[PDB]
Design an enzyme around this catalytic site. Sequence first.
Site, PDB file in Angstrom:
ATOM      1  N   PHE A 198       3.661   0.958 -24.703  1.00 40.89           N
ATOM      2  CA  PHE A 198       3.488   2.338 -24.203  1.00 40.89           C
ATOM      3  C   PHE A 198       3.011   3.772 -25.301  1.00 40.89           C
ATOM      4  O   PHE A 198       3.668   4.593 -25.328  1.00 40.89           O
ATOM      5  CB  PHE A 198       4.613   2.768 -23.456  1.00 40.89           C
ATOM      6  CG  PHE A 198       4.805   1.671 -22.403  1.00 40.89           C
ATOM      7  CD1 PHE A 198       3.764   1.248 -21.547  1.00 40.89           C
ATOM      8  CD2 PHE A 198       5.982   1.033 -22.555  1.00 40.89           C
ATOM      9  CE1 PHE A 198       4.298   0.096 -20.668  1.00 40.89           C
ATOM     10  CE2 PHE A 198       6.292  -0.115 -21.614  1.00 40.89           C
ATOM     11  CZ  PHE A 198       5.486  -0.508 -20.699  1.00 40.89           C
ATOM     12  N   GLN A 211      11.525   1.897 -23.835  1.00 39.38           N
ATOM     13  CA  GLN A 211      11.171   0.515 -24.542  1.00 39.38           C
ATOM     14  C   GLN A 211       9.937   0.578 -24.733  1.00 39.38           C
ATOM     15  O   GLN A 211       9.167   1.361 -24.408  1.00 39.38           O
ATOM     16  CB  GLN A 211      11.599  -0.516 -23.344  1.00 39.38           C
ATOM     17  CG  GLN A 211      12.966  -0.300 -22.707  1.00 39.38           C
ATOM     18  CD  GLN A 211      13.081  -1.786 -21.987  1.00 39.38           C
ATOM     19  OE1 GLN A 211      13.200  -2.803 -22.465  1.00 39.38           O
ATOM     20  NE2 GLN A 211      13.351  -1.589 -20.720  1.00 39.38           N
ATOM     21  N   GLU A 212       9.622  -0.110 -25.815  1.00 39.43           N
ATOM     22  CA  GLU A 212       8.124  -0.487 -26.336  1.00 39.43           C
ATOM     23  C   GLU A 212       7.234   0.848 -26.522  1.00 39.43           C
ATOM     24  O   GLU A 212       6.347   1.079 -25.887  1.00 39.43           O
ATOM     25  CB  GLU A 212       7.249  -1.328 -25.241  1.00 39.43           C
ATOM     26  CG  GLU A 212       7.754  -2.576 -25.073  1.00 39.43           C
ATOM     27  CD  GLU A 212       7.368  -3.692 -26.277  1.00 39.43           C
ATOM     28  OE1 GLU A 212       6.566  -3.029 -26.980  1.00 39.43           O
ATOM     29  OE2 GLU A 212       7.601  -4.805 -26.160  1.00 39.43           O
ATOM     30  N   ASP A 213       7.987   1.523 -27.383  1.00 40.76           N
ATOM     31  CA  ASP A 213       7.448   2.981 -28.013  1.00 40.76           C
ATOM     32  C   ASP A 213       7.307   3.730 -26.722  1.00 40.76           C
ATOM     33  O   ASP A 213       6.505   4.671 -26.831  1.00 40.76           O
ATOM     34  CB  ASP A 213       6.048   2.462 -28.600  1.00 40.76           C
ATOM     35  CG  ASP A 213       6.297   1.877 -29.658  1.00 40.76           C
ATOM     36  OD1 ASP A 213       5.345   0.946 -29.993  1.00 40.76           O
ATOM     37  OD2 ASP A 213       7.104   1.986 -30.562  1.00 40.76           O
ATOM     38  N   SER A 214       7.819   4.006 -25.807  1.00 38.34           N
ATOM     39  CA  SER A 214       7.983   4.962 -24.713  1.00 38.34           C
ATOM     40  C   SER A 214       9.403   5.991 -25.426  1.00 38.34           C
ATOM     41  O   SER A 214      10.147   5.413 -26.304  1.00 38.34           O
ATOM     42  CB  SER A 214       8.062   4.830 -23.551  1.00 38.34           C
ATOM     43  OG  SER A 214       8.799   3.711 -22.883  1.00 38.34           O
TER      44      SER A 214
END
Lengths: 51, 49, 66, 263, 61, 144, 97, 44, 45, 48
Positions: free
Chosen positions: G47, F17-20
């Site tokens: 992240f 999530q959130e660009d991982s």
Amino acid sequence: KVHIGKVPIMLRSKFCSLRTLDEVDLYKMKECPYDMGGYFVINGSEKVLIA
Amino acid sequence: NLMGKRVDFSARTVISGDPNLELDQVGVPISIAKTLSYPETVTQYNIHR
Amino acid sequence: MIIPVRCFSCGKVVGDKWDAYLRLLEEGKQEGDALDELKLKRYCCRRMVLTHVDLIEKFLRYNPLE
Amino acid sequence: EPKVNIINAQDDEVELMLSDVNLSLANSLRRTMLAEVPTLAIDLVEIKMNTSVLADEFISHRLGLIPLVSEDVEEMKYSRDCTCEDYCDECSVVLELSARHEGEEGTTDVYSSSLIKVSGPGNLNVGEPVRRDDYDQGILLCKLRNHQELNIRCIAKKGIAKEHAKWSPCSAIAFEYDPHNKLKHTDFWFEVDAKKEWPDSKYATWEEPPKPGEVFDYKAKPNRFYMTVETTGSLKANQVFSRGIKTLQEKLANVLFELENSR
Amino acid sequence: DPTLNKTVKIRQGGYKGKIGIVKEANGDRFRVELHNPNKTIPIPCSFLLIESTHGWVPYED
Amino acid sequence: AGQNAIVAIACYSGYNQEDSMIMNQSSIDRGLFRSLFFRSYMDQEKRFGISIVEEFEKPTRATTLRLKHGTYEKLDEDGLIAPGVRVSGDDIIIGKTTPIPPYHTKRDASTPLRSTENGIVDQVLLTTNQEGLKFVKVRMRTTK
Amino acid sequence: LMDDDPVLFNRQPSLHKMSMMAHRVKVMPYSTFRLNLSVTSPYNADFDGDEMNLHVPQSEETRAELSQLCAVPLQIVSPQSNKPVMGIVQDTLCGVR
Amino acid sequence: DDTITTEDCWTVISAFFEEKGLVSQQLDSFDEFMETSIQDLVWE
Amino acid sequence: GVKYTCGACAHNFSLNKSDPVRCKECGHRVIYKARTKRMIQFDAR
Amino acid sequence: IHTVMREKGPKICAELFGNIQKVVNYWLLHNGFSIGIGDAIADASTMK
RNA sequence: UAUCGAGAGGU
Ligand SMILES: Nc1ncnc2c1ncn2[C@@H]1O[C@H](COP(=O)(O)CP(=O)(O)OP(=O)(O)O)[C@@H](O)[C@H]1O
Ligand SMILES: [Mg+2]
Ligand SMILES: [Zn+2]
Ligand SMILES: [Zn+2]
Ligand SMILES: [Zn+2]
């Protein structure tokens, strides 16, 4: 012929000792054929001029 | 130097998400947890620990 | 740098097929057909051989330093 | 009650249908074959000389990935459980490689077939680098030029892929069930018509399509699992499937032992 | 201590067969700097072989 | 400058999530996106007077003050570490001394490996500079 | 530093007070700081390379200020707009629909 | 004749880079400095 | 004392630190240290 | 979230995030969700 | 375990 100073040479220009040679001797000079020059070597450091 | 300054007992690293952590937790790398410290006073109740 | 031993995604050995792949291309086969003949069926494995770049041939030109 | 039907077979891949088992058992078997069936693989590289253009650990990583004959590996011990100091003849196979290029011209290609077995737990059939044919040079390892030399001593050990993927006997494992989606376990994405836009299973002709009237059998469960087990040659495909069953058994047996000891 | 900075082989444990160097040997629990991955591990001194004049000798060097 | 990755765009376990992103550990085991890393350290001897020059050497504790805290036991007699040797942070890789102006006469000027780094010595250059004093470069290699 | 020690956690720029909240330590392998996804919003964290800062109180008095004033659960509703500053996001919000 | 195609356009562009490469504005500028500018600057 | 290698002609030789820094064979002043006596191990992972 | 905070206090309200997350993320792990180029494509009638 | 600057970068 009085000496007035030294001018840093841009690699692969017409005044660079690499302009001839050709891939065979480029490899002997440890030079990479993908390296297209356009920069100087000053105290070992590669310096590029920004337009 | 006076309204703000550099401080001891601080740390910084890249962040990651964790679906398996509580809202109020922070996962801390072991290496950071071994560099940072807390000075706990020795009493009868924690001397063995 | 040099052909990988295994496909990254599934693990199938592809490091024994590099010479055979170059040979099929000399014989005039098209890349897709050469991969087909080598039994590289999954597209993860096909990517390994089709997009490898043999840089060790470039590094060897540098006259050994001992 | 478990039933098996071998659709095709050869040294490095077996295609088969598995039926009258639970989905979880077919899947646990799938996972076990990928992750926990032991094989033999180089795990320690002593570099005595490396003047190639490749870095020591670059070469060591490729060496670990070379598939070695692992047929008798079950009778072989793990290094961590062996009473000897360092490695020895009962828990490891030793291979050696030495290459050199003589001549002022040309390139010497070093292949996995130049790996020479030097010792090993005799007379167990373990440690030979897998070969396709008899004329098969095997996997390309390195390349050498005038005066460049490679002289390494390799220690091969028993391990499983949980530790490092090089110990896996498989590559892919194809796996599927319910080719006509009668169970409704997936809900198909479509633009115009879902049936025309999604390809047919390669096992579509092994089950009968749903009739246009047919009501939804809400009691049916998955029951026929088609899978193909490919291997790297360290083990034959039938061996991986057999040892997969064996390994999953010992794991359950060890749990059963521990329960009957907790009493 | 006479075994610091001297080369070592590990004969027990998960690191069995690996080379290292004694980075710190305060007492009983040594710190061996493994060669193979960049990590220095805690290991008991009983687990080590030290190199000497003739082969790998246990902690009798 | 990259690799063709097999990519699924999916919600799997929520660890992307959130660009991982979730990466395949087995692909990593087989070499995916693995890279070599090189760092070179440079040092040279400096001149401070007519016959006062720095010197590359393995400095003896009896004659040199302010030794570094790291180990000097990986240095050869030339003051330089040799290729093939594992190094950790604060290990000395270039031994150099500076004389003290007017026993125990030199001062340490050695170079430790950067404290946050480790790896293997890859190559060691020894030469002289334009002024004739000694000049070294130590390249360290590791794999990330 | 050990499990459930209170620490002050912080992402720049520190625009408002819930840019610095007290979390309970959980010691973990690997080299990143781990966040529950629902605290990304007040930190404006994600992240893609973001880094965050951690500060360790050094006494019984400063530990108590962190756990009794700055702790994440005390910060769920902010005085800025008399409403929460944390909610369900991303996978969990897509999935709950 | 016939019409100039897109592939022909890339044939032209390849010819550009075949003659000029990627750093010719650096090299030609410096070449003129060594050939002429130093001499002219001295004679200023 | 310590083995070196000439960066130009690849001759191998030793130097007793006090010797000047050049190759005996071709006189090149750029030389490289030869590999360590120590054994090197890698985990092949 | 606002309501549980006022009604149950910060401890319960903080557990609420974890509870919701653990159920939903499990269900979503086993349901799946994706996006592809197809989801940008309107049919030929709508394009006209 | 320096100081003063400069340049390139990260969110
Ligand atoms: N130059 C800067 N100065 C101050 N803060 C900065 C900054 N650059 C970035 N930031 C911080 O980082 C945030 C930028 O986040 P990004 O990752 O750059 C974009 P986003 O709006 O979160 O996502 P998007 O990529 O989906 O549009 C800012 O809101 C601020 O918190
Ligand atoms: Mg960001
Ligand atoms: Zn594949
Ligand atoms: Zn043994
Ligand atoms: Zn020479």
